[PDB]
Amino acid sequence: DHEAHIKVLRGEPTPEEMAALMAVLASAGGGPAEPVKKERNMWGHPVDKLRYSVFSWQRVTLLERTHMRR
Amino acid sequence: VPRQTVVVEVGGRRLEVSLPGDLAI
Amino acid sequence: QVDIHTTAGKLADLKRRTEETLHPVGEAAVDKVHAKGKLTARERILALLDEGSFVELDALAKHRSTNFGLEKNRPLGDGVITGYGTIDGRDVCIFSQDATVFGGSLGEVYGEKIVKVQELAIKTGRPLIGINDGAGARIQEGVVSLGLYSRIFHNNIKASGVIPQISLIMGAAAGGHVYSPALTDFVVMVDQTSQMFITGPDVIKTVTGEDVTMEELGGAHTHMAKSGTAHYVASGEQDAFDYVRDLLSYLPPNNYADPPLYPVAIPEGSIEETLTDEDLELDTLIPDSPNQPYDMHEVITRILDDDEFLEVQAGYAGNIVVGFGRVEGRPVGIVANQPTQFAGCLDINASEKAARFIRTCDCFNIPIVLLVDVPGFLPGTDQEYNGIIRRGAKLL
Amino acid sequence: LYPVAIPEGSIEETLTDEDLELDTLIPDSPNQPYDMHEVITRILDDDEFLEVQAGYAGNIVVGFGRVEGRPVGIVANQPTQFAGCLDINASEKAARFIRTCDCFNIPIVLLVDVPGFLPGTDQEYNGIIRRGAKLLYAYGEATVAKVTVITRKSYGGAYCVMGSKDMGADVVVAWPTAQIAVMGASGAVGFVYRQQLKEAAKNGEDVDALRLELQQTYEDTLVNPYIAAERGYVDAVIPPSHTRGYVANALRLLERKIVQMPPKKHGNIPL
Amino acid sequence: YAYGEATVAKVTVITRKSYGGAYCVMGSKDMGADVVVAWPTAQIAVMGASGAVGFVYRQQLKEAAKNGEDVDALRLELQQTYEDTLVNPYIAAERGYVDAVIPPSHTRGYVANALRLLERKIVQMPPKKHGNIPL
Amino acid sequence: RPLIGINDGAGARIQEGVVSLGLYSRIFHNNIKASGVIPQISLIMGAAAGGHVYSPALTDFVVMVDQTSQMFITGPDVIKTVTGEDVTMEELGGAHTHMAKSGTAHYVASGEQDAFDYVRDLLSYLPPNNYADPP
Amino acid sequence: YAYGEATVAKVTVITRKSYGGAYCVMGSKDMGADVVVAWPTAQIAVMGASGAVGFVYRQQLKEAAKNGEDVDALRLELQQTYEDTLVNPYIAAERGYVDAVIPPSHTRGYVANALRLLERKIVQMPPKKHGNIPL
Amino acid sequence: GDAVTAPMQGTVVKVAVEEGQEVSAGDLVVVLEAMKMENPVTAHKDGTITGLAVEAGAAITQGTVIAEI
Ligand SMILES: CCC(=O)SCCNC(=O)CCNC(=O)[C@H](O)C(C)(C)COP(=O)(O)OP(=O)(O)OC[C@H]1O[C@@H](n2cnc3c(N)ncnc32)[C@H](O)[C@@H]1OP(=O)(O)O
Ligand SMILES: CCC(=O)SCCNC(=O)CCNC(=O)[C@H](O)C(C)(C)COP(=O)(O)OP(=O)(O)OC[C@H]1O[C@@H](n2cnc3c(N)ncnc32)[C@H](O)[C@@H]1OP(=O)(O)O
Ligand SMILES: *C(=O)CCCC[C@@H]1SC[C@@H]2NC(=O)N[C@@H]21
Ligand SMILES: *C(=O)CCCC[C@@H]1SC[C@@H]2NC(=O)N[C@@H]21
């Protein structure tokens, strides 16, 4: 029972106004309802387009890190 | 132009709610 | 007719040319193609891709050859339709060869169009689908066509293991047309209307005296059962399209991407507490007698999601079964021994089939599950002489 | 990136009234100018376009916009200023804009209507060659998605500079009014059919009539999109109304690119 | 696949025939051959002159048979023309598929020079875990 | 290895059409790719016109011959027709012009042999590529 | 930009003058100069003595103007003081912007030593596709 | 400044203004044929036009004054 509920802090609507309000709010709600897991596609990632010095620490902290983050 | 009809059960009481079919936000 | 010197007139002229691109050699040729029960190169693209998703490239191309009076005849598109689109919402580059233009033979502009789509696919990391139907090189053009074949093969090799390459064979692919399909990852032939061969039956008869039909020499059944070259033998063009879509459903767009992963609700608990009746069916599957075989598809289906299994090379080397499935919505490549064929023994053909399948899965990040019921290798002097050692090590 | 609604359907099916206006935008006579902001606003989202260096080198328009929420950089020739001819200032302005967009992974769309480089001794003395090669270098080295739309002219070296296929343009589309040629019909007929226009004068024929007839033939046969389309330098000749859905589709296709270049510490762009 | 994949210095010397798909297989220019040279006896063509004539001039051959002419002599004459015109290294050299047509005695020197020039190469390929060579 | 290009010019071959433009674009693209990778030296020993002038501008060094070489995008005739200015090829794009005024030429040579000597002297200081050390 | 971007060895020899933004442009220590030496005649300052005096002593020069003193003499006296105090290599030497003030004859030795030691500088910039040099 | 001047040598094909007329910024003042193009020359500021010195069909040089606004 530990979830955030909608609160009507002020006002005492009757069942009809409550129903209208909830219907409108549900209609307003949207966006990604139950989206699939976002597909990984590292092809042509910006990090791969950079010039790295042969001894650059960013070869570890930026390039390898980006390729390995999962 | 079309209208959508939905059913709500506030406190168990059945209610029929008519909303515009193109409701935005 | 609107004046060609006006903007509206130029637009109308463009529309006239675009309409001409649909039937480059006249409506009679399209009628003949339909009369044989086949689809045109354009209809094939439009049937494979999603509705309205096809974008064409180099539609208005014409060949530049002047050899042997070729300049008298310059069909628009040069006999191949190229572009990109989507299959199940995911982009794919596509080309389709047209057998009504010079028998589908490859010329310079033809090859350049194919090369353009190949380079686009490699650049953007999207799968490439080729529909091959052609009579080898366009002889009137000469060695320029050979050069374009070399460029196409080089592009296939360059993309090998980088992007999924799928070849459909929906006609007589002769001579050089056969080598790009061999280099691509998957091959789907149509049952009785498609053939692949290097040398024609006429030359075979002249040199060796062997009488053979085109169907026997390079038919879909031949390349499935004997050559081990085709991965699917569709009963029709729509069936081939369906199989290709199923393949793409399992594969990622490129080697740097993950395979598509469906959302499946993982039940909670331990394996013991999560067993199903279909799982319990496995506890009694193995015959009591080791001499009694069983069908490994029974295990494959009972472990895969929805019992859905896309088999690869079903009619080739039946002693091993390879294919695609999903476990908890996660694509997997199954390799399994088949006790009902040669007692499940490994042999040359099964080893090569399984090896190529495993390498494809590894190229495109698809994990592999082996189901092992194997007593050893198939004994035989023929196996030894054909190289069971050398070609069995490929699976290793 | 901004979230936008993508209308489902083919590019022919999803045309809008605003898109249809591009079909009549281009004037009938090739001498008549038009404003390229009309194309820019009609292809960008919400007609919003943030121009850069608006008051400088008006013969080229550079700026930022969005195509289906994706930021893009527009580089366009402006026919109303100097007939759209490239020059030193336009070259430098467009070159640095392109290099900024490439540094920060912003794809570029080039709207091309260009008859050549602005003739003049001042251009040569101030380095139209050296300083115009900068734009060529910038476009060549850009590894972001690069889309080209040709409206009207694309001649000679200006063609090579303004997003040619062989310079790495990923998708080149041309309107039916596009005129791609080595040079204008007048100079061409002045060179091809040479000695023939002179034999006419030797015989005393109407040299002017013969020239004009030959120019008409050259314009009818060669000054059009279709020779380049046949060679493959143009990926598609399209109705103008289709431009927005071709740019959007092309950028979506090219959102991820890998281009291989030889390893260098850094380049040697002309300065 | 092996030849196309190879990134080492690749040199091709053609002596007599290079026909059809075997041309493409055996070190063609567009498959990545760095230097291609051909002897004067090189014969680079789509197919043998016999089949090429039997196809390009096929309508004339049937017409001659219908008209009662000497079809065999006509075929041999057409074949001779085809061989003398196209079965040679010069069409490929014109297209640039052959870098140089050389006397056969120049082969060792050309190969040595080419290898010395090509001892250092850089070729960019798309990144991949590994290839998918046919098996 | 270094690349040396000796240019004489006349621009695109008009009869061939836009195929020449395509090849010019390809050449410029290769110059840009090689930029900073290998030394690129341009000799102007003729009247380079039209598209011939853009590859040299992308190369690392430019050596013109004093009185027998010119670079200019558009000719004096077109300049006269459009702007009314009257100018010769030498004044418009001569070696002295591109040295003193436009800052494009790096060396102005008294003769062709002098230009060759300067090119050899340049190469004496430069490495074969950016991964090598200067001699 | 070019100087700051360069990662090859960078040596600066200041002979007489290095003022203001020109000082920053021409091989300043903080712009990355590996070695900086100054001859005894060097003169490193924000600007010339005349402008410096006309600014830092505006107060005293205007007081002299009020009192009628010879501003044309006071200005020269102050300019001489400023030149003798600050227009020299020694303030930069104190700040460490000049590695050493050397006799002119030492120049070749210092340059040779620096170049011998700085064959391979272990230096780097942040990763980028390329720079954005002004154009 | 307040001077509207030709951007190049060209032929005055059309004059879109009259002396003493009030015009706005961006309003067309003349049309010059030059480089095979009816290029427009427009007012860069709002104001009254004075010193109009353009006649149709006249060939004029770069930098010549079209008007003062
Ligand atoms: C180097 C790699 C190579 O493949 S070189 C060897 C190529 N040679 C061949 O493939 C032999 C030609 N093939 C054929 O005869 C047929 O097209 C095949 C493929 C057998 C199918 O037979 P069918 O469907 O009856 O066609 P068909 O023989 O009536 O030919 C139809 C039209 O196309 C033409 N055609 C065919 N192949 C080529 C070719 N390679 N080059 C040029 N033209 C070709 C035929 O001449 C015929 O033209 P038409 O419309 O009848 O005038
Ligand atoms: C993108 C590149 C372009 O748009 S430029 C396209 C053409 N540009 C030109 O300037 C062509 C004409 N150029 C000239 O003014 C001169 O011919 C130049 C090249 C400067 C040389 O002058 P000159 O030494 O007198 O030679 P010439 O005029 O007698 O010509 C000699 C032969 O060359 C030919 N030629 C020259 N240019 C071209 C060209 N672009 N395309 C085709 N042919 C060309 C001339 O016709 C002449 O041929 P022939 O020997 O008389 O048969
Ligand atoms: C009875 O002795 C039969 C022996 C069969 C041996 C089996 S056959 C198939 C496997 N391959 C092999 O070498 N041994 C196994
Ligand atoms: C007409 O063809 C000759 C005069 C105008 C030529 C125009 S001017 C601007 C373009 N640049 C060039 O070199 N020719 C074009």
Tab-separated table of C-alpha atoms in Angstrom, chain C residues 67-68 108 122 137-151 153-154 156-162 176 179 182-185 255-256 352 355-356 358-365 394, chain E residues 1-5 10 18-25 28-32 44-47 51-53 55-57 82 86 91-92 95 97 123-135:
chain	number	residue	atom	x	y	z
C	67	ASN	CA	28.486	-2.129	-78.318
C	68	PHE	CA	26.603	-4.202	-80.870
C	108	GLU	CA	27.756	-1.313	-65.855
C	122	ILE	CA	27.431	-0.726	-44.985
C	137	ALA	CA	26.934	-10.727	-67.315
C	138	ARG	CA	25.549	-8.673	-70.186
C	139	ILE	CA	27.733	-10.087	-72.933
C	140	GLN	CA	27.447	-7.093	-75.246
C	141	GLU	CA	29.093	-4.847	-72.657
C	142	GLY	CA	32.292	-6.817	-72.139
C	143	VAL	CA	34.726	-6.833	-69.238
C	144	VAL	CA	33.178	-3.734	-67.676
C	145	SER	CA	30.472	-6.050	-66.367
C	146	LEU	CA	33.180	-8.280	-64.903
C	147	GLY	CA	34.626	-5.273	-63.121
C	148	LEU	CA	31.247	-4.440	-61.637
C	149	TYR	CA	30.838	-8.033	-60.496
C	150	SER	CA	34.182	-7.728	-58.735
C	151	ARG	CA	33.056	-4.558	-56.988
C	153	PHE	CA	31.671	-9.281	-54.482
C	154	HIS	CA	34.145	-7.021	-52.709
C	156	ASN	CA	29.715	-8.441	-49.968
C	157	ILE	CA	33.003	-9.553	-48.429
C	158	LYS	CA	33.476	-6.172	-46.778
C	159	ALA	CA	29.999	-6.327	-45.245
C	160	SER	CA	30.306	-9.991	-44.248
C	161	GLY	CA	29.764	-10.173	-40.514
C	162	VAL	CA	28.979	-6.452	-40.378
C	176	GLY	CA	28.336	-14.534	-62.007
C	179	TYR	CA	28.597	-15.605	-56.162
C	182	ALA	CA	27.091	-17.502	-51.763
C	183	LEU	CA	28.881	-14.681	-49.966
C	184	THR	CA	25.754	-13.440	-48.189
C	185	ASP	CA	24.611	-14.795	-44.832
C	255	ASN	CA	27.036	-6.334	-35.421
C	256	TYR	CA	27.154	-3.402	-32.982
C	352	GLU	CA	29.700	-27.524	-42.094
C	355	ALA	CA	29.692	-24.365	-38.142
C	356	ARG	CA	28.366	-21.710	-40.496
C	358	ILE	CA	27.289	-20.842	-35.201
C	359	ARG	CA	29.568	-18.312	-36.861
C	360	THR	CA	26.576	-16.301	-38.083
C	361	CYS	CA	25.089	-16.261	-34.593
C	362	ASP	CA	28.404	-15.166	-33.102
C	363	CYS	CA	28.809	-12.465	-35.739
C	364	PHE	CA	25.425	-10.998	-34.850
C	365	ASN	CA	25.462	-11.480	-31.064
C	394	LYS	CA	35.328	-26.347	-38.774
E	1	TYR	CA	36.370	-14.265	-49.797
E	2	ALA	CA	39.992	-15.015	-48.937
E	3	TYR	CA	41.429	-12.871	-51.699
E	4	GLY	CA	39.049	-9.992	-51.047
E	5	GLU	CA	39.710	-10.107	-47.320
E	10	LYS	CA	48.464	-8.254	-53.760
E	18	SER	CA	41.152	-14.511	-67.666
E	19	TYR	CA	37.535	-15.353	-68.482
E	20	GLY	CA	34.234	-14.692	-66.798
E	21	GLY	CA	33.933	-15.333	-63.100
E	22	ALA	CA	37.407	-16.818	-62.925
E	23	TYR	CA	38.638	-13.346	-63.836
E	24	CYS	CA	36.878	-11.951	-60.787
E	25	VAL	CA	38.179	-14.749	-58.568
E	28	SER	CA	40.761	-8.706	-60.321
E	29	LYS	CA	41.313	-4.992	-59.836
E	30	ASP	CA	38.016	-4.256	-58.107
E	31	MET	CA	38.596	-7.150	-55.705
E	32	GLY	CA	41.541	-5.189	-54.310
E	44	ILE	CA	40.504	-10.908	-70.829
E	45	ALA	CA	36.882	-11.404	-71.863
E	46	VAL	CA	33.458	-12.268	-70.505
E	47	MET	CA	33.552	-15.670	-72.182
E	51	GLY	CA	29.955	-18.631	-76.935
E	52	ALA	CA	30.103	-14.862	-77.234
E	53	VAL	CA	29.466	-15.020	-80.970
E	55	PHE	CA	25.001	-15.250	-78.458
E	56	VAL	CA	25.678	-11.739	-79.781
E	57	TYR	CA	25.168	-12.700	-83.439
E	82	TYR	CA	35.392	-11.064	-82.084
E	86	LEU	CA	37.985	-7.992	-77.946
E	91	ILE	CA	39.878	-3.349	-73.487
E	92	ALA	CA	40.683	-4.054	-69.840
E	95	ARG	CA	39.015	0.573	-68.651
E	97	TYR	CA	41.462	-2.889	-64.954
E	123	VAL	CA	43.216	-0.395	-45.780
E	124	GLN	CA	40.105	0.599	-43.830
E	125	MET	CA	37.396	-1.995	-43.303
E	126	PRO	CA	34.174	-1.753	-41.320
E	127	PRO	CA	34.575	-2.964	-37.739
E	128	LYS	CA	33.480	-6.535	-37.112
E	129	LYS	CA	33.926	-9.230	-34.496
E	130	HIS	CA	34.961	-11.533	-37.332
E	131	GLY	CA	34.011	-12.476	-40.860
E	132	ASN	CA	31.452	-14.982	-42.060
E	133	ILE	CA	33.406	-16.836	-44.745
E	134	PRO	CA	31.366	-19.564	-46.484
E	135	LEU	CA	32.011	-23.003	-45.053
